[PDB]
Enzyme design. Structure first.
Site, PDB file in Angstrom:
ATOM      1  N   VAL A 240       3.533   3.524   3.786  1.00  0.00           N
ATOM      2  CA  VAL A 240       2.386   3.622   4.682  1.00  0.00           C
ATOM      3  C   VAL A 240       2.766   3.595   6.169  1.00  0.00           C
ATOM      4  CG1 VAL A 240       1.938   1.139   4.361  1.00  0.00           C
ATOM      5  CG2 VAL A 240       0.107   2.632   5.249  1.00  0.00           C
TER       6      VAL A 240
ATOM      7  N   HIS B 236       5.624  -2.636   4.426  1.00  0.00           N
ATOM      8  CA  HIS B 236       5.034  -2.722   3.081  1.00  0.00           C
ATOM      9  C   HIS B 236       6.000  -2.260   1.982  1.00  0.00           C
ATOM     10  CE1 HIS B 236       2.491  -2.124  -0.410  1.00  0.00           C
ATOM     11  NE2 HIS B 236       2.650  -0.816  -0.318  1.00  0.00           N
TER      12      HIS B 236
ATOM     13  N   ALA C 142      -3.168   5.125   3.683  1.00  0.00           N
ATOM     14  CA  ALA C 142      -2.760   4.326   2.523  1.00  0.00           C
ATOM     15  C   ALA C 142      -1.487   4.852   1.830  1.00  0.00           C
ATOM     16  CB  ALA C 142      -3.913   4.219   1.508  1.00  0.00           C
TER      17      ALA C 142
ATOM     18  N   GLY D 254      -0.872  12.364  -0.970  1.00  0.00           N
ATOM     19  CA  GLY D 254       0.574  12.253  -0.891  1.00  0.00           C
ATOM     20  C   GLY D 254       1.242  12.294  -2.245  1.00  0.00           C
TER      21      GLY D 254
ATOM     22  N   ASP E 183      -0.336  -6.998  -0.152  1.00  0.00           N
ATOM     23  CA  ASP E 183       0.749  -7.983  -0.271  1.00  0.00           C
ATOM     24  C   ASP E 183       0.204  -9.360   0.098  1.00  0.00           C
ATOM     25  OD1 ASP E 183       1.870  -5.353   1.345  1.00  0.00           O
ATOM     26  OD2 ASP E 183       3.149  -5.817  -0.371  1.00  0.00           O
TER      27      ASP E 183
ATOM     28  N   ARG F 216      -2.510 -10.417  -2.761  1.00  0.00           N
ATOM     29  CA  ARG F 216      -1.786 -10.940  -3.908  1.00  0.00           C
ATOM     30  C   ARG F 216      -1.231 -12.312  -3.560  1.00  0.00           C
ATOM     31  NH1 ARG F 216       2.134  -5.974  -3.565  1.00  0.00           N
ATOM     32  NH2 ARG F 216       1.037  -4.269  -4.663  1.00  0.00           N
TER      33      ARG F 216
ATOM     34  N   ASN G 275     -10.082 -19.828   0.818  1.00  0.00           N
ATOM     35  CA  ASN G 275      -9.534 -21.062   1.379  1.00  0.00           C
ATOM     36  C   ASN G 275      -8.033 -20.965   1.653  1.00  0.00           C
ATOM     37  OD1 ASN G 275     -11.742 -22.881  -0.821  1.00  0.00           O
ATOM     38  ND2 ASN G 275     -12.075 -22.300   1.325  1.00  0.00           N
TER      39      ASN G 275
ATOM     40  N   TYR H 150     -11.993  20.047   5.350  1.00  0.00           N
ATOM     41  CA  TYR H 150     -11.754  19.616   6.732  1.00  0.00           C
ATOM     42  C   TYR H 150     -12.933  19.719   7.702  1.00  0.00           C
ATOM     43  CZ  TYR H 150      -7.091  19.464   4.905  1.00  0.00           C
ATOM     44  OH  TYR H 150      -5.997  19.164   4.140  1.00  0.00           O
TER      45      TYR H 150
ATOM     46  N   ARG I 268      13.892   7.160  -0.969  1.00  0.00           N
ATOM     47  CA  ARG I 268      12.660   7.007  -0.219  1.00  0.00           C
ATOM     48  C   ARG I 268      12.554   8.073   0.878  1.00  0.00           C
ATOM     49  NH1 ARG I 268       9.885   2.014   2.757  1.00  0.00           N
ATOM     50  NH2 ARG I 268      12.052   1.300   3.057  1.00  0.00           N
TER      51      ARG I 268
HETATM   52  O1  FBP Z   1     -11.000 -21.629   4.407  1.00  0.00           O
HETATM   53  P1  FBP Z   1     -11.894 -21.755   5.619  1.00  0.00           P
HETATM   54  O2  FBP Z   1     -11.059 -22.072   6.836  1.00  0.00           O
HETATM   55  O3  FBP Z   1     -12.930 -22.834   5.377  1.00  0.00           O
HETATM   56  O4  FBP Z   1     -12.657 -20.370   5.903  1.00  0.00           O
HETATM   57  C1  FBP Z   1     -13.483 -19.731   4.959  1.00  0.00           C
HETATM   58  C2  FBP Z   1     -13.530 -18.299   5.452  1.00  0.00           C
HETATM   59  O5  FBP Z   1     -12.244 -17.995   5.952  1.00  0.00           O
HETATM   60  C3  FBP Z   1     -11.887 -16.662   5.659  1.00  0.00           C
HETATM   61  O6  FBP Z   1     -12.097 -15.865   6.850  1.00  0.00           O
HETATM   62  C4  FBP Z   1     -10.394 -16.533   5.332  1.00  0.00           C
HETATM   63  O7  FBP Z   1      -9.674 -16.612   6.556  1.00  0.00           O
HETATM   64  P2  FBP Z   1      -8.291 -15.817   6.856  1.00  0.00           P
HETATM   65  O8  FBP Z   1      -8.288 -14.514   6.086  1.00  0.00           O
HETATM   66  O9  FBP Z   1      -8.177 -15.525   8.334  1.00  0.00           O
HETATM   67  O10 FBP Z   1      -7.104 -16.668   6.473  1.00  0.00           O
HETATM   68  C5  FBP Z   1     -12.865 -16.165   4.591  1.00  0.00           C
HETATM   69  O11 FBP Z   1     -12.181 -15.859   3.411  1.00  0.00           O
HETATM   70  C6  FBP Z   1     -13.850 -17.297   4.355  1.00  0.00           C
HETATM   71  O12 FBP Z   1     -15.192 -16.866   4.460  1.00  0.00           O
END
Ligand code: FBP
Ligand code: NAD
Ligand code: FBP
Lengths: 301, 310, 301, 312
Positions: D122, D175, D118, D79, D148, D151, D166, D65, D88
């Site tokens: 959480v 969560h 974490a 934890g 979440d 994934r 993208n 600490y 839970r």
């Molecule tokens: O898909 P886009 O709009 O071209 O943006 C690419 C950038 O967007 C991101 O910020 C993802 O955006 P979000 O997490 O806000 O949805 C980065 O993964 C990446 O560098």
């Protein structure tokens, strides 16, 4: 045997581009080619003198077209100035082709869109292997300004500029947003107190080139970076959505023209293409924008 | 306020590459670009900042004045005249000493309490003058020194031997200039001394490495003739130093540092291996120079005396 | 086309290694092959899930031998009565399959005894010896360098020191060339005070023991080897020419041949590309003959 | 002077989190804190043993600490975990007693950074790190629905053919089981996922629901496979850390205090936020449909209950 990139013409763009590469480590190899052998060679000396500090060091050496046989990307950085670049371009593509080159083309010199298609002619390879700056820099210029306006990370800002690269670009305000909330829905709180500041931001983008160019003479760090970005998506097969110069054929009502829109990029080149569910204004704007570009082509060919 | 900030002063070719390298590597969270020619500085902020969306390591880059150096963790000075083809060094020094005079006063008047990083040439002399002008301790004032000259040596040794620049270990030291000397005596490739390597060829190895040294001392001349200036090397170099500094690295780099007796030298700012970290200099790497090398290192620090006195 | 590694054996070691590339973006793709599907698949899904938030987009997948065919690197970390005789049996098959898979790239072994299995690997393979590489003494040398770094106040990147010989308990430091910033440790002990060389030998006694010590505390050692393997893999894929103390074959070099043993070596895309031969001292020369003996007397049967 | 993260809890998560940092160079210092001195100290040893081959050398130490005094971030991974037989609320009870001593000792050492929890569940423990610690809400942050979300983005990248960066699609809520997608905004490259199955109706629009109940089941799934989950949460904790150390103003579905938003209040729960060196810079309020509305409040309903026996 490894990721090689041949870069043609070591001007400010080609240089800045090259130095971005040095620093980010995107390719393992770089060869700088120029008629101005003097200006290239010296580049390959300065750059190499940072090698021992580069976190992702590149083997940087100079050469001539005989070295692009195996090159995996050739980057091209070499009024009526058009045909001049054409004499230059056809005067320069013919050299690389004979070398044995069998990779993917990448071009950045204005007028990029014209010169991209212009490059598609001389070359003679599937339309998935010639690319140009498109509106990435303009999308990135638009992101930046929207991140500063909204006060959230640029990467968390999603907004395209699409179309050709020049006097006729346009914003995709429709599917523009910040973190999944549409640009439109953001202004919805205050009737026009955002709106027009954002329309001004459109102009700052459209104009930024001239502005910078007025201030320090040219533009180069930006395209250098977008260059580097497109490269990465390619070498490392990312399936990444960029706004490059993509050959449509039905998309956005247009055909027979290289234009800037959301294209996926990977080891091959242009993979897919996203047709965006636009709207009258933007569709019309793109359609019209698709216009001027068709014109300028025929005769110069 | 709480986060790593670099103030750059002088956005010519040198500083702007250094700002770009930073823009690409992500050493710092924030970068302020100041230069008396407002046009070029704010013109450069715009151009860097537009790459932001495609940069990996996030940097807020703005325009600013001397007052913005208040909470700068580092000030990097790259401003000042170039050595015109006629004049001497003592001459240029006079002219660059009045630049650094104005600059440092303002830097200090802003409230700045960090570390100085000097690119202006001749960088040794001008590091000495930042120390005196500013008031600061000799540990917090650093110049690129011979880092570039070593990275230069490192590379040429690299290609000539077929091993990474990282695995080749040899310093160029003393002066950033003509009286600079290689510590051949400590040098090696993976720990195997260079002198033992050359065995393979006499009249084929032992003097090609002399050409290599020659190529290092006058690399700055060969570059300028071929495109105009030199900035990409000094860019990495400078960037390496900021990183070592900002990240509290305790790394060893041959920067310009105050000697008081080390190496047979004192009251001079000179290039020798130093341990660099969050405070600046923390320690001095004492090489055992051989006869040939102590002798040369003395000529080098005396010559820096040749200018510091007047 | 793109960088591909095929990891065989997703235990704690193989699992940690995958996480290191997936964090450093060393590779483009990795395939995870394990005698245990419900472990390897879990691994695969646990990695890919963080892909959205990761530095370089690495594509990870579960698979089997057949997937190695185009791998630039197979990395093996798969492994009372004799441990050696067992794993000899295990490698024979593992290696057997990937040979018949068509794989024509580079083997990286990690499983202990790392030098024997690199020897055996090579034996079963019939690939040129330069393409068969063990993690050698690189994890020992790294432990040694963190330790001197904590000793001399300089960074691990600036502490130069080799451990050589067998990875195990007849491993020897190469003090005659150990140096910090270029200055020998000999000189640095001419400073100090009472307590130098005595505590330095403790440091060397602690490098022999670190494995044994981490296990006493957490049942297994995995991070450091992950980081070793991850760095060799790096040198290989991006052809860096890196001197590392991997396990490698000897040509009489060091007064002993036929063995696979930890020594300084030049690593690139082709594999091994030159043994760094250091000039050992009276002590070092002999500690190294005793290591090579022990190793080459494990092979014989 | 330099970036310092404190990790309290050298278990599967804590250790994985440390290994991400050691491979990514986001912090400059990390000190591992753990009443199991052998494990804690074994990890520091093994992690330091890679330091030479790290691209961004981190400094790691075993401490306790007193060493959080100058830390910028304290990351709680300490934890107990839920036994299949226990409820839970039994888990929480056990975990809240650990947090009070942990959060009590950290504060008494001089710490004044941003907490990052974490430990499961959480959001509950986030609230309790907040209450216990008496810091501003903006600077107590929980792991939320970031994984979440991550994934939810991987699976959608493999189903739609473009890079996970993208893909844009928040999971929000608590969560756990009552979390939920925000389809109303979800989008590849900006185009809504509604517009994407518009071409391919329900044969698709039930494939996605599958992708959702797998996001909602990945925990138990991996936990049945490889024995335990942890790499994923690590990359989430690293991303969050990175956004706070480098002052990002990045958006992440982290657990946060809502002061009215979404019809919820006096509750930490996972929603998109703007995250920086100050903690939460803003709260991203998305225009939700009626269903997303209904699921969100209910998920808020579950946490509120578990909280009540100590809500006072
Ligand atoms: O898909 P886009 O709009 O071209 O943006 C690419 C950038 O967007 C991101 O910020 C993802 O955006 P979000 O997490 O806000 O949805 C980065 O993964 C990446 O560098
Ligand atoms: N989208 C943008 O706003 C953006 C930004 C910057 C530059 N650009 C384009 O990039 C191009 C390069 O700009 P710059 O600032 O480097 O100008 P520049 O003239 O300095 O660079 C172009 C380089 O090409 C080389 N070159 C010229 N002719 C050649 C030939 N025939 N063969 C081989 N090499 C030849 C020259 O070395 C020259 O330096 C410009 O033409 C510009 O249109 C676009
Ligand atoms: O650049 P420097 O200052 O010479 O150090 C480079 C580093 O890389 C290395 O070549 C790795 O080799 P070692 O295993 O022998 O330490 C070391 O010599 C040194 O730690």
């Amino acid at each position: 045997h490894v990721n090689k990139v041949a870069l043609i013409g070591a001007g400010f763009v080609g240089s800045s581009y090259a130095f971005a590469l040095i620093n980010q480590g995107i390719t393992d190899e770089l060869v700088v080619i120029d008629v101005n052998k003097e200006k290239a060679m010296g580049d390959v000396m300065d750059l190499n003198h940072g090698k021992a500090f580069a976190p992702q060091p590149v083997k940087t050496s100079y050469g001539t077209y005989e070295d692009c046989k195996d090159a995996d990307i050739v980057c091209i950085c070499a009024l009526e100035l058009v045909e001049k670049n054409l004499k230059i371009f056809k005067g320069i593509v013919s050299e690389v082709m004979a070398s044995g080159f069998d990779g993917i083309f990448l071009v950045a010199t204005n007028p990029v869109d014209i010169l991209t298609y212009a490059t598609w002619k001389f070359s003679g390879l599937p339309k998935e292997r010639v690319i140009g700056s498109g509106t990435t820099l303009d999308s990135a210029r638009f992101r930046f300004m929207l991140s500063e306006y909204f006060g959230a990370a640029p990467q968390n800002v999603h907004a395209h500029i699409i179309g050709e690269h020049g006097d006729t670009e346009l914003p995709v305000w429709s599917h523009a947003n910040v973190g999944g909330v549409p640009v439109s829905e953001l202004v919805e709180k205050n009737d026009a107190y955002k709106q027009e500041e954002l329309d001004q931001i459109v102009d700052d983008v459209k104009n930024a080139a001239y502005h910078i160019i007025e201030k320090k003479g040219a533009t180069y760090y930006g395209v250098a970076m977008s260059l580097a970005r497109i490269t990465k998506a390619i070498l490392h097969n990312e399936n990444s959505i960029l706004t490059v110069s993509t050959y449509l054929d039905g998309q956005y009502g247009a055909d027979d023209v290289y234009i800037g829109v959301p294209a996926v990029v990977n080891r091959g080149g242009i993979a897919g293409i996203t047709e965006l569910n636009l709207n009258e204004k933007e569709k019309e704007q793109f359609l019209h924008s698709a216009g001027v570009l068709k014109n300028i082509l025929k005769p110069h060919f």
